[PDB]
CSV table of C-alpha atoms and ligand atoms in Angstrom, one decimal:
chain,number,residue,atom,x,y,z
V,6,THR,CA,-15.3,-4.8,21.8
V,7,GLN,CA,-18.2,-3.5,19.5
V,8,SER,CA,-19.1,-0.8,17.1
V,9,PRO,CA,-20.3,2.4,19.0
V,10,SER,CA,-24.2,3.1,18.9
V,11,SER,CA,-25.2,6.6,17.1
V,12,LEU,CA,-27.4,9.2,18.6
V,13,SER,CA,-28.3,12.1,16.2
V,14,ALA,CA,-28.7,15.3,18.0
V,15,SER,CA,-29.0,19.4,17.5
V,16,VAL,CA,-27.7,22.3,19.3
V,17,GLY,CA,-29.1,23.1,22.6
V,18,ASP,CA,-30.8,19.6,23.0
V,19,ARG,CA,-30.6,17.8,26.3
V,20,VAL,CA,-28.7,14.2,26.0
V,21,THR,CA,-29.0,11.5,28.8
V,22,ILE,CA,-26.5,8.2,28.3
V,23,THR,CA,-27.0,5.6,30.5
V,24,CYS,CA,-23.9,3.1,31.3
V,25,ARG,CA,-25.0,-0.5,31.2
V,26,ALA,CA,-23.4,-1.8,34.1
V,27,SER,CA,-22.9,-5.4,35.4
V,28,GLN,CA,-23.0,-7.1,39.3
V,29,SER,CA,-22.3,-3.2,40.3
V,30,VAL,CA,-23.8,-2.0,43.2
V,31,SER,CA,-20.9,-1.2,44.7
V,32,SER,CA,-19.0,0.2,41.7
V,33,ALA,CA,-17.7,3.8,40.3
V,34,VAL,CA,-18.1,5.1,37.1
V,35,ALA,CA,-15.4,7.4,34.9
V,36,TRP,CA,-16.9,9.0,31.8
V,37,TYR,CA,-14.7,10.1,28.5
V,38,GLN,CA,-15.0,12.2,25.4
V,39,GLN,CA,-13.3,10.8,22.2
V,40,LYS,CA,-13.1,12.8,18.9
V,41,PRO,CA,-11.7,10.9,15.5
V,42,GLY,CA,-7.9,10.5,15.7
V,43,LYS,CA,-7.4,11.9,19.3
V,44,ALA,CA,-6.9,10.1,22.6
V,45,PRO,CA,-10.0,10.0,24.8
V,46,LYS,CA,-10.7,12.9,27.2
V,47,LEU,CA,-11.7,12.6,30.9
V,48,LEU,CA,-15.0,14.5,31.4
V,49,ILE,CA,-15.2,16.4,34.6
V,50,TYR,CA,-19.2,16.7,35.4
V,51,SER,CA,-21.2,17.8,38.3
V,61,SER,CA,-21.1,22.4,34.9
V,62,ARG,CA,-22.8,21.5,31.4
V,63,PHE,CA,-22.2,18.0,31.9
V,64,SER,CA,-23.9,16.4,35.1
V,65,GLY,CA,-24.3,12.7,36.3
V,66,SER,CA,-26.2,10.6,38.5
V,67,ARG,CA,-26.8,6.8,39.6
V,68,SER,CA,-30.3,5.7,39.2
V,69,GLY,CA,-30.2,2.1,40.8
V,70,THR,CA,-27.4,0.5,39.4
V,71,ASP,CA,-27.2,2.4,36.1
V,72,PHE,CA,-24.7,5.6,36.1
V,73,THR,CA,-26.0,8.3,33.6
V,74,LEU,CA,-24.3,11.0,32.0
V,75,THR,CA,-26.5,14.3,31.1
V,76,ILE,CA,-25.2,16.9,28.6
V,77,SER,CA,-27.9,19.7,29.7
V,78,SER,CA,-27.3,21.9,26.5
V,79,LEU,CA,-25.6,20.6,23.7
V,80,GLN,CA,-22.4,22.3,22.2
V,81,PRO,CA,-21.0,22.2,19.2
V,82,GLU,CA,-17.6,21.0,20.4
V,83,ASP,CA,-20.0,18.2,22.5
V,84,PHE,CA,-20.2,16.1,19.3
V,85,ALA,CA,-18.5,13.0,20.0
V,86,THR,CA,-17.8,9.6,21.1
V,87,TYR,CA,-18.9,8.9,25.0
V,88,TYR,CA,-17.4,5.9,27.1
V,89,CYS,CA,-17.9,5.4,30.3
V,90,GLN,CA,-15.7,3.4,32.6
V,91,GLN,CA,-16.7,1.0,35.6
V,92,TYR,CA,-14.3,-0.2,38.1
V,93,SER,CA,-15.0,-2.3,41.2
V,94,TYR,CA,-13.4,-5.3,42.7
V,95,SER,CA,-11.5,-6.9,40.4
V,96,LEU,CA,-13.2,-5.4,37.2
V,97,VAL,CA,-12.3,-2.7,35.1
V,98,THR,CA,-14.3,-2.2,31.9
V,99,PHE,CA,-15.5,0.5,29.2
V,100,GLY,CA,-19.1,0.6,28.0
V,101,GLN,CA,-20.1,0.3,24.3
V,102,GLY,CA,-19.7,3.9,23.3
V,103,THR,CA,-22.4,6.5,22.2
V,104,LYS,CA,-21.5,8.5,19.0
V,105,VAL,CA,-23.3,11.9,19.3
V,106,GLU,CA,-23.3,13.2,15.7
V,107,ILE,CA,-24.9,16.5,14.2
V,108,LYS,CA,-28.4,16.2,12.9
V,109,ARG,CA,-29.2,18.1,9.8
V,110,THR,CA,-31.5,18.4,6.7
V,111,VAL,CA,-31.5,15.3,4.0
V,112,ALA,CA,-28.6,15.8,1.6
V,113,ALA,CA,-28.6,13.0,-1.3
V,114,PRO,CA,-25.2,12.1,-2.4
V,115,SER,CA,-23.6,12.9,-5.9
V,116,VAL,CA,-22.5,9.8,-7.3
V,117,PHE,CA,-19.3,8.9,-9.6
V,118,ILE,CA,-18.1,5.7,-10.9
V,119,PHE,CA,-14.4,5.0,-12.2
V,120,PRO,CA,-13.6,2.4,-14.2
V,121,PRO,CA,-9.8,0.7,-13.4
V,122,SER,CA,-6.8,2.6,-14.8
V,123,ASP,CA,-5.2,1.4,-17.5
V,124,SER,CA,-2.2,1.5,-15.2
V,125,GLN,CA,-3.6,-1.1,-13.0
V,126,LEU,CA,-5.0,-3.1,-16.2
V,127,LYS,CA,-1.4,-3.4,-17.4
V,128,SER,CA,-0.2,-4.3,-14.0
V,129,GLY,CA,-2.6,-7.6,-14.1
V,130,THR,CA,-5.4,-6.1,-11.7
V,131,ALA,CA,-8.5,-4.5,-11.8
V,132,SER,CA,-10.3,-2.4,-9.3
V,133,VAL,CA,-13.6,-0.5,-10.3
V,134,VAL,CA,-14.9,2.5,-7.7
V,135,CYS,CA,-18.1,3.9,-7.0
V,136,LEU,CA,-18.1,7.2,-5.1
V,137,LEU,CA,-20.9,8.7,-2.8
V,138,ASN,CA,-20.1,12.7,-1.8
V,139,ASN,CA,-21.6,14.7,0.6
V,140,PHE,CA,-24.6,12.9,1.5
V,141,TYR,CA,-27.1,13.0,4.9
V,142,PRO,CA,-28.0,10.8,7.0
V,143,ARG,CA,-25.0,8.3,6.8
V,144,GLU,CA,-27.1,5.3,6.1
V,145,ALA,CA,-26.7,4.2,2.4
V,146,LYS,CA,-26.7,1.1,0.2
V,147,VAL,CA,-24.5,0.8,-3.0
V,148,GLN,CA,-25.4,-2.4,-4.8
V,149,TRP,CA,-22.8,-3.6,-7.7
V,150,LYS,CA,-24.3,-4.7,-11.0
V,151,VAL,CA,-22.2,-6.5,-13.6
V,152,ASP,CA,-24.0,-7.2,-16.7
V,153,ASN,CA,-27.4,-6.7,-14.5
V,154,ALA,CA,-26.0,-9.6,-12.2
V,155,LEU,CA,-26.3,-8.3,-8.8
V,156,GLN,CA,-22.9,-8.8,-7.1
V,157,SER,CA,-22.2,-9.6,-3.4
V,158,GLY,CA,-18.9,-10.1,-1.2
V,159,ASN,CA,-16.7,-9.0,-3.9
V,160,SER,CA,-16.6,-5.2,-2.8
V,161,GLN,CA,-15.7,-3.6,0.0
V,162,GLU,CA,-16.7,0.1,1.5
V,163,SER,CA,-15.7,2.9,4.0
V,164,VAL,CA,-17.2,5.9,5.1
V,165,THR,CA,-15.6,9.1,6.1
V,166,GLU,CA,-16.6,11.0,9.4
V,167,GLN,CA,-19.0,13.5,9.8
V,168,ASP,CA,-17.7,16.6,7.6
V,169,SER,CA,-16.6,19.6,9.1
V,170,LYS,CA,-18.2,21.7,6.6
V,171,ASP,CA,-21.6,20.7,5.9
V,172,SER,CA,-22.0,17.9,8.5
V,173,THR,CA,-22.2,15.1,5.8
V,174,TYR,CA,-20.8,11.7,4.8
V,175,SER,CA,-18.7,10.5,2.0
V,176,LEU,CA,-18.4,6.7,1.0
V,177,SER,CA,-16.2,4.9,-1.6
V,178,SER,CA,-17.3,1.2,-2.5
V,179,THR,CA,-14.5,-0.6,-4.3
V,180,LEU,CA,-15.4,-3.7,-6.7
V,181,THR,CA,-12.2,-5.8,-6.8
V,182,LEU,CA,-12.0,-8.3,-9.6
V,183,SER,CA,-9.1,-10.2,-11.6
V,184,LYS,CA,-8.1,-8.6,-14.8
V,185,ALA,CA,-9.4,-11.5,-17.2
V,186,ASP,CA,-12.5,-11.5,-15.3
V,187,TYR,CA,-13.2,-7.9,-15.5
V,188,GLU,CA,-12.5,-8.1,-19.3
V,189,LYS,CA,-15.2,-10.8,-20.3
V,190,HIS,CA,-17.9,-8.5,-18.7
V,191,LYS,CA,-19.1,-5.4,-20.8
V,192,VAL,CA,-21.4,-3.3,-18.2
V,193,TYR,CA,-20.4,-2.0,-15.0
V,194,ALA,CA,-22.8,-0.3,-12.7
V,195,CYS,CA,-23.4,0.8,-9.0
V,196,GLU,CA,-26.8,1.5,-7.8
V,197,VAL,CA,-27.2,3.8,-4.9
V,198,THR,CA,-30.0,3.9,-2.5
V,199,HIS,CA,-30.5,6.8,0.1
V,200,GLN,CA,-32.7,9.1,2.1
V,201,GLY,CA,-32.6,11.6,-0.1
V,202,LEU,CA,-33.0,9.9,-3.3
V,203,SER,CA,-36.9,9.3,-4.3
V,204,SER,CA,-35.5,6.6,-6.7
V,205,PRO,CA,-32.2,4.6,-6.7
V,206,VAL,CA,-29.5,6.5,-8.6
V,207,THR,CA,-27.3,3.9,-10.9
V,208,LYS,CA,-24.1,5.1,-12.6
V,209,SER,CA,-22.6,2.8,-15.1
V,210,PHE,CA,-20.2,2.4,-17.8
V,211,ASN,CA,-19.2,0.1,-20.9
V,212,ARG,CA,-16.0,-1.4,-20.6
V,213,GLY,CA,-13.6,0.3,-23.1
V,214,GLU,CA,-15.3,3.4,-24.3
M,4,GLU,CA,3.3,19.8,31.9
M,5,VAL,CA,2.4,16.3,32.1
M,6,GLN,CA,3.0,13.9,29.0
M,7,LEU,CA,2.7,10.4,28.2
M,8,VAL,CA,4.6,9.1,25.3
M,9,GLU,CA,4.5,5.6,23.5
M,10,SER,CA,6.6,3.3,21.6
M,11,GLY,CA,7.6,-0.1,20.6
M,12,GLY,CA,4.3,-0.5,18.3
M,13,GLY,CA,4.3,-2.1,15.2
M,14,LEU,CA,4.1,-5.5,13.2
M,15,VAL,CA,4.5,-9.2,14.6
M,16,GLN,CA,3.3,-12.5,13.1
M,17,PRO,CA,0.5,-14.1,15.5
M,18,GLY,CA,2.1,-16.1,18.5
M,19,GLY,CA,4.7,-13.6,18.4
M,20,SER,CA,6.0,-11.4,20.9
M,21,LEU,CA,6.2,-7.4,21.3
M,22,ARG,CA,7.1,-5.0,24.2
M,23,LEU,CA,5.4,-1.5,24.3
M,24,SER,CA,6.6,1.3,26.4
M,25,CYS,CA,4.9,4.2,28.1
M,26,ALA,CA,7.2,7.2,28.8
M,27,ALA,CA,5.9,9.8,31.7
M,28,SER,CA,7.0,13.4,32.0
M,29,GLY,CA,5.8,16.1,34.5
M,30,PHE,CA,5.2,13.4,37.0
M,31,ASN,CA,6.6,9.7,38.2
M,32,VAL,CA,4.5,6.8,37.7
M,33,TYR,CA,5.2,5.6,41.2
M,34,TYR,CA,2.5,8.2,42.4
M,35,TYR,CA,-0.2,7.0,40.2
M,36,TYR,CA,-2.2,4.0,38.5
M,37,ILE,CA,-1.1,3.6,35.1
M,38,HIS,CA,-3.5,2.0,32.6
M,39,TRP,CA,-3.3,0.5,29.0
M,40,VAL,CA,-6.0,0.5,26.9
M,41,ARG,CA,-6.5,-0.3,23.3
M,42,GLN,CA,-8.8,0.4,20.3
M,43,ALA,CA,-9.2,-1.6,17.3
M,44,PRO,CA,-10.0,0.2,14.4
M,45,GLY,CA,-13.9,1.5,14.1
M,46,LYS,CA,-14.5,-0.4,17.8
M,47,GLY,CA,-15.0,1.0,21.0
M,48,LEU,CA,-12.2,1.4,23.7
M,49,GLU,CA,-11.3,-2.3,25.6
M,50,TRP,CA,-9.3,-1.8,29.1
M,51,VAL,CA,-6.4,-4.0,29.1
M,52,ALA,CA,-4.2,-3.8,32.2
M,53,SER,CA,-3.2,-1.5,35.2
M,54,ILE,CA,-0.8,-1.3,37.5
M,55,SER,CA,-1.1,0.6,41.4
M,56,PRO,CA,1.0,3.1,42.9
M,57,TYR,CA,3.6,2.6,45.5
M,58,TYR,CA,3.4,-1.3,45.8
M,59,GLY,CA,3.1,-2.0,42.0
M,60,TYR,CA,0.2,-4.3,42.1
M,61,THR,CA,-1.7,-5.6,38.5
M,62,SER,CA,-4.7,-6.2,37.3
M,63,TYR,CA,-5.6,-7.4,33.5
M,64,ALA,CA,-8.6,-8.0,30.9
M,65,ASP,CA,-9.8,-11.6,30.7
M,66,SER,CA,-9.0,-11.1,27.1
M,67,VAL,CA,-5.3,-11.0,27.5
M,68,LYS,CA,-5.3,-13.6,30.1
M,69,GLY,CA,-1.5,-14.6,31.3
M,70,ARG,CA,-0.4,-13.5,27.7
M,71,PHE,CA,0.2,-9.9,28.8
M,72,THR,CA,2.4,-8.6,31.3
M,73,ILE,CA,2.3,-4.9,32.8
M,74,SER,CA,5.2,-3.3,34.6
M,75,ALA,CA,6.9,0.0,35.6
M,76,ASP,CA,10.6,1.2,36.1
M,77,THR,CA,10.4,4.2,38.5
M,78,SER,CA,13.9,5.2,37.9
M,79,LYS,CA,13.5,5.4,34.3
M,80,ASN,CA,9.9,6.8,35.1
M,81,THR,CA,8.5,4.4,32.3
M,82,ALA,CA,5.5,2.1,32.2
M,83,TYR,CA,5.4,-1.2,30.1
M,84,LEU,CA,3.3,-3.5,28.4
M,85,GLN,CA,4.9,-6.9,27.3
M,86,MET,CA,2.7,-8.8,25.2
M,87,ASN,CA,3.4,-12.7,24.2
M,88,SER,CA,1.3,-15.1,22.2
M,89,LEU,CA,-0.2,-12.3,20.0
M,90,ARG,CA,-3.2,-12.9,18.1
M,91,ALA,CA,-4.9,-11.0,15.2
M,92,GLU,CA,-7.5,-9.8,17.5
M,93,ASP,CA,-4.8,-8.0,19.6
M,94,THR,CA,-4.4,-5.7,16.4
M,95,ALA,CA,-5.3,-2.0,17.9
M,96,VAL,CA,-4.3,1.1,18.7
M,97,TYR,CA,-2.8,1.0,22.3
M,98,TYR,CA,-3.1,4.0,24.4
M,99,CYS,CA,-1.1,4.4,27.9
M,100,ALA,CA,-3.0,6.7,30.6
M,101,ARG,CA,-2.2,8.1,34.0
M,102,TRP,CA,-5.3,7.8,36.6
M,103,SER,CA,-5.7,10.8,38.9
M,104,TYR,CA,-7.9,10.3,42.3
M,112,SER,CA,-11.5,10.7,39.6
M,113,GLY,CA,-10.5,9.1,36.5
M,114,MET,CA,-7.6,8.8,33.5
M,115,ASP,CA,-6.9,12.4,32.8
M,116,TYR,CA,-3.8,12.3,31.1
M,117,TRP,CA,-3.4,9.9,27.8
M,118,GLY,CA,-0.6,9.0,25.5
M,119,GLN,CA,-0.9,9.6,21.5
M,120,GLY,CA,-1.3,5.8,21.3
M,121,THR,CA,0.7,3.4,18.9
M,122,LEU,CA,-0.4,0.8,16.4
M,123,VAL,CA,0.0,-3.0,17.0
M,124,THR,CA,-0.4,-5.1,14.1
M,125,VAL,CA,-0.9,-8.6,14.5
M,126,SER,CA,-0.8,-10.6,11.0
M,127,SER,CA,0.9,-13.3,8.9
M,128,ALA,CA,1.2,-10.9,5.8
M,129,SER,CA,4.7,-9.5,5.3
M,130,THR,CA,5.4,-5.6,4.9
M,131,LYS,CA,4.7,-4.2,1.4
M,132,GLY,CA,4.6,-0.8,-0.3
M,133,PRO,CA,1.6,0.8,-1.8
M,134,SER,CA,0.7,0.8,-5.5
M,135,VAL,CA,-0.9,4.3,-6.8
M,136,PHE,CA,-3.4,4.5,-9.2
M,137,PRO,CA,-5.1,7.1,-10.6
M,138,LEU,CA,-8.9,7.8,-10.6
M,139,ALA,CA,-9.3,10.0,-13.4
M,140,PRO,CA,-11.9,12.7,-13.8
M,141,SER,CA,-14.0,12.6,-17.1
M,142,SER,CA,-17.5,13.5,-18.7
M,143,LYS,CA,-18.8,11.2,-16.0
M,144,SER,CA,-17.1,12.0,-13.1
M,145,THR,CA,-18.5,15.9,-13.7
M,146,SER,CA,-21.6,17.3,-13.3
M,147,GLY,CA,-23.0,20.9,-13.2
M,148,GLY,CA,-19.4,22.2,-12.7
M,149,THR,CA,-17.4,20.1,-10.4
M,150,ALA,CA,-15.3,17.3,-11.4
M,151,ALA,CA,-14.4,14.6,-9.0
M,152,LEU,CA,-10.9,12.9,-9.1
M,153,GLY,CA,-8.5,10.9,-6.9
M,154,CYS,CA,-6.0,8.3,-6.2
M,155,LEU,CA,-6.4,4.5,-5.2
M,156,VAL,CA,-3.7,3.4,-2.9
M,157,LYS,CA,-3.9,-0.3,-2.9
M,158,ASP,CA,-1.8,-3.3,-1.4
M,159,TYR,CA,0.0,-1.8,1.6
M,160,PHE,CA,0.9,-3.4,4.6
M,161,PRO,CA,0.4,-2.8,7.2
M,162,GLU,CA,-1.2,0.6,8.2
M,163,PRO,CA,-0.6,3.5,8.1
M,164,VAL,CA,-0.9,5.2,4.7
M,165,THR,CA,-0.8,9.4,4.8
M,166,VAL,CA,-2.2,11.2,1.6
M,167,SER,CA,-1.9,14.8,0.7
M,168,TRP,CA,-2.8,16.8,-2.5
M,169,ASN,CA,-0.6,19.2,-4.1
M,170,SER,CA,1.9,18.8,-0.9
M,171,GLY,CA,-0.8,20.1,1.3
M,172,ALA,CA,-1.8,23.2,-0.6
M,173,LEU,CA,-5.4,21.4,-1.6
M,174,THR,CA,-7.2,20.4,1.4
M,175,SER,CA,-10.8,21.5,0.4
M,176,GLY,CA,-13.1,19.2,-0.7
M,177,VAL,CA,-10.6,16.6,0.3
M,178,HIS,CA,-12.0,13.1,1.2
M,179,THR,CA,-9.5,10.4,2.3
M,180,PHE,CA,-11.5,7.3,3.3
M,181,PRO,CA,-10.5,4.7,6.3
M,182,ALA,CA,-8.6,2.0,4.9
M,183,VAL,CA,-10.2,-1.4,4.5
M,184,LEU,CA,-8.6,-4.7,5.1
M,185,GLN,CA,-8.9,-6.9,2.0
M,186,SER,CA,-9.5,-10.7,2.2
M,187,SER,CA,-5.7,-11.1,1.1
M,188,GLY,CA,-4.7,-9.6,4.4
M,189,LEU,CA,-3.3,-6.4,2.6
M,190,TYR,CA,-4.8,-2.8,3.2
M,191,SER,CA,-6.4,-0.3,0.5
M,192,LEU,CA,-7.5,3.2,0.7
M,193,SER,CA,-9.0,5.5,-1.7
M,194,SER,CA,-8.5,9.6,-1.7
M,195,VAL,CA,-10.7,11.8,-3.4
M,196,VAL,CA,-11.0,15.6,-3.9
M,197,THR,CA,-13.8,17.7,-6.2
M,198,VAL,CA,-12.7,20.3,-8.3
M,199,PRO,CA,-14.2,23.0,-10.6
M,200,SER,CA,-14.5,21.1,-14.0
M,201,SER,CA,-12.8,24.1,-15.8
M,202,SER,CA,-9.6,23.5,-13.6
M,203,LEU,CA,-8.8,20.4,-15.2
M,204,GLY,CA,-7.2,21.9,-18.1
M,205,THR,CA,-5.3,24.3,-15.8
M,206,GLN,CA,-4.5,23.3,-12.4
M,207,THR,CA,-2.2,20.0,-11.8
M,208,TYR,CA,-3.5,18.0,-9.3
M,209,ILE,CA,-1.0,15.3,-7.2
M,210,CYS,CA,-1.7,12.8,-4.4
M,211,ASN,CA,1.2,12.5,-2.1
M,212,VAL,CA,1.3,9.0,-0.5
M,213,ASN,CA,3.5,8.2,2.4
M,214,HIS,CA,3.8,4.6,3.8
M,215,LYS,CA,6.5,5.0,6.4
M,216,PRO,CA,6.5,1.4,7.5
M,217,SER,CA,7.8,0.4,4.2
M,218,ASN,CA,9.7,3.9,3.8
M,219,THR,CA,7.7,4.5,0.3
M,220,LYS,CA,7.2,7.9,-0.9
M,221,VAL,CA,5.0,7.9,-4.0
M,222,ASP,CA,3.8,10.9,-6.2
M,223,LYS,CA,0.9,10.4,-8.7
M,224,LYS,CA,-0.1,13.3,-11.1
M,225,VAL,CA,-4.0,12.5,-11.9
M,226,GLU,CA,-4.8,13.4,-15.4
M,227,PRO,CA,-8.0,13.6,-17.3
X,301,LIG,ZN1,-15.7,17.7,2.5
């Protein structure tokens, strides 16, 4: 019902996930592991995976983290007249800081001829995931007219990629000159700004 | 050889009705608890309903009240989820699962349920052209903007599947208009821009839409 919390870890690390319980006492638990694009998998624990109950809170422990363990974990609690899944913990691969390479794309002439305009800013292969994109139109800071999405952790170098799309009407696009996206990230000592002038 | 195959997912207007199916194989639903679990895009798992073995007693999440009905046909070996008075927040991938006495050890592939007032529309495909500013120290970035389609999903490939390295196909975003949009990008050597051709192959099954787009500098 909410976004999964994120946990950064390395191979060989020990990880303990706590199931946030309710009116438990008389409650039982089941743990699941889910990878992007696939159905969850039931976790059989006791041997790398172990579990126990400390009070009302169920815990799942990964003794020594393996690269196939990097996933999103859920606890399921079931009791009398109650069945629920916990929030979910996404265990992601920790790696060295990597700055994004930034690219900006003007609206294609094809889209403009079709009566609309989308400006795209691309952030390629960065770590950690946390990144802020700020759109500027004639040096006016924008907000509420752009949307972004992020890929899952790359299977190649454990980085992320982000694309931000600024949506404007064709008429409004053509009455401004300078379009820029400003990128803020861990790996950047100073914010990187990619820009273009309309019609160059 | 245990398998659960789901069906019935699709698009419906809010207030409408949908029946999902979960066909079992390698076992009969009569002998096991069968569960329905859903997952909204980007969100965690949410338990929806369950039906008991032998006697077929049921249980529902508070969020699906007396709107949803779970049942099973033991002769056809299929479990169902009747969904009435559907709301936008019911939009999710729905999974059916078998319980084994313990946890849900077998899951279906999931089926997508979209609840919205928007109507089915094929996407428009626009190029994200490479240039002198989409390049840097040898590598150039290019892609395709797949805009204004409904509902999910859209699939994108490059050069009919031959190009997979450096390919980033981002998750779709739901625009305020109610229509979806996504971008697929790929980074290539700048020197290949003159030689190699790059084509994004877009498929949008809900509208039977197939579109190719050659991306040129
Ligand atoms: Zn990549």
